[PDB]
C-alpha cells in the first residue's frame, strides 16, 4: 500500500504545515501537524476543556462506529518550545492520503496549552518520530507510520515541504520526479527516539565550505533551523546590522537586508537554503526589525533541522530495520 497527501503551510510565513487525516467512521476530518519530532498523534476533541477550543476541528469519538476507549490509558507530553496537552486514549481507523491504519491510537486532548489553543487552523499533531518517544501510560503505542510500515510498498515515508506553498507527505514510496539529481543518505541514530543524524559542514552565501560534523534532528515540527552558535553566528555577521537580541530571543535583522543562502552538508552533497527562507518576517506588526530562521541551539542541548531547512530538501525518512534519512535538491 501506499498513502499521498498534500501538506500546506497555516499562515504567509511557513510558520507550520498542516495535513488533512480522516479519523473514525464516519470519517472526521482533522488538519495535523506532522511532526518528525515527536511520537504521539493527538487530536483536539469533544473531551478537550471548552475554554481551551479557539476555532479548532474537533474529534468527536462518541460520533464514530470504530472509537473503542483504550481503558486506563492517558497521555501527557511537553514540547521542547513549552507547550503542552494531555488526556485520554482511544483506538479508532485514521487514514492519511488513501493509507488506512485501524486501531491506531488517537490521543484526544483534554487540555492544552495557550499556544495551541491559539492557532486555530492546527487541529492537532501527529508524530513521525520513533514510537519509544511515545508517551501513553501504562501501555506505549505506536506511531501512524510504525502501525503502517509493515503494510507499505516499501518501509519509507517522504517530505517534500513548500516554501510559501503545499507541499507533500508521501507514504510506502518515493517519487523519482519531485527531486532532483540523487539522494544521498546518511546514517542515523534512534538512540534518543529522533530522526538524529550528522551533517557534513556548511557554507555561509557564496563562502567557502566549512567541513564539521554537525548532529542534530530531521524535524518537520520545528519551524526553524536550530545550530551551534558559532555556526549561527558566522551565518548572521553577513547580514548588516543584524544581531542577537535578548528582548526579541533570537538574532534578527533589518527587514530591508537581502539575506545570503545558507548550504548544509549530506555527505558529500549540499543542500542549499535560499536567504529568502530565513526570513520570518517583523518581530512585531509594522516592526522594520525582522526575526531570523537560523537560530542559535545553544540552551536547546540539540541541533534542529526544522522546517527551514528541510522546506530546501526532499527528505527520505527510511524506516527499513537500520533507519536512514535521504537528501535531495529539488
Given at each position: 500500500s501506499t498513502g499521498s497527501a498534500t501538506t500546506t503551510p497555516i499562515d504567509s510565513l511557513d510558520d507550520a504545515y498542516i495535513t488533512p487525516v480522516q479519523i473514525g467512521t464516519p470519517a472526521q476530518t482533522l488538519n495535523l501537524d506532522?511532526?518528525?519530532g515527536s511520537s504521539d498523534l493527538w487530536v483536539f476533541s469533544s473531551e478537550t476543556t471548552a475554554s481551551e477550543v479557539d476555532g479548532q476541528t474537533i474529534y468527536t469519538?462518541?460520533?464514530?462506529?470504530?472509537a473503542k476507549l483504550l481503558s486506563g490509558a492517558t497521555w501527557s507530553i511537553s514540547y521542547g518550545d513549552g507547550s503542552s496537552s494531555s488526556g485520554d486514549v482511544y483506538t479508532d481507523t485514521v487514514s492519511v492520503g488513501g493509507l488506512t491504519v485501524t486501531g491506531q491510537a488517537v490521543e484526544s486532548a483534554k487540555k492544552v496549552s495557550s499556544s495551541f489553543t491559539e492557532d486555530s487552523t492546527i487541529d492537532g499533531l501527529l508524530g513521525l518520530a520513533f514510537s519509544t518517544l511515545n508517551t501513553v501510560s501504562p501501555t506505549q503505542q505506536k506511531t501512524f507510520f510504525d502501525n503502517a510500515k509493515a503494510s507499505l510498498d516499501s518501509p519509507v515515508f517522504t517530505a517534500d515541504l513548500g516554501y510559501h506553498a503545499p507541499g507533500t507527505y508521501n507514504f510506502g514510496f518515493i517519487d523519482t520526479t519531485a527531486y532532483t539529481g540523487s539522494i544521498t543518505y546518511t546514517a542515523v541514530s534512534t538512540k534518543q527516539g529522533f530522526w538524529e543524524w550528522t551533517s557534513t559542514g556548511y557554507a555561509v552565501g557564496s563562502g567557502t565550505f566549512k567541513s564539521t560534523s554537525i548532529d542534530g534532528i530531521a524535524d518537520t515540527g520545528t519551524t526553524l533551523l536550530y545550530l551551534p552558535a558559532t555556526v549561527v553566528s558566522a551565518y548572521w555577521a553577513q547580514v548588516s546590522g543584524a544581531k542577537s537580541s535578548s528582548s526579541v530571543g533570537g538574532y534578527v535583522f533589518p527587514c530591508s537586508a537581502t539575506l545570503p543562502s545558507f548550504t548544509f552538508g549530506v555527505g558529500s552533497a549540499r543542500i542549499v537554503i535560499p536567504g529568502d527562507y530565513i526570513d520570518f518576517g517583523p518581530i512585531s506588526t509594522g516592526s522594520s526589525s525582522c526575526f531570523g530562521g537560523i537560530q542559535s541551539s545553544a540552551g536547546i542541548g540539540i541541533n534542529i533541522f526544522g522546517d527551514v531547512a528541510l522546506k530546501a530538501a526532499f527528505v527520505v525518512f527510511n524506516g527499513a530495520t537500520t533507519p536512514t534519512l535521504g537528501f535531495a535538491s529539488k
Open positions: 506532522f511532526d518528525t469519538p462518541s460520533k464514530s462506529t470504530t
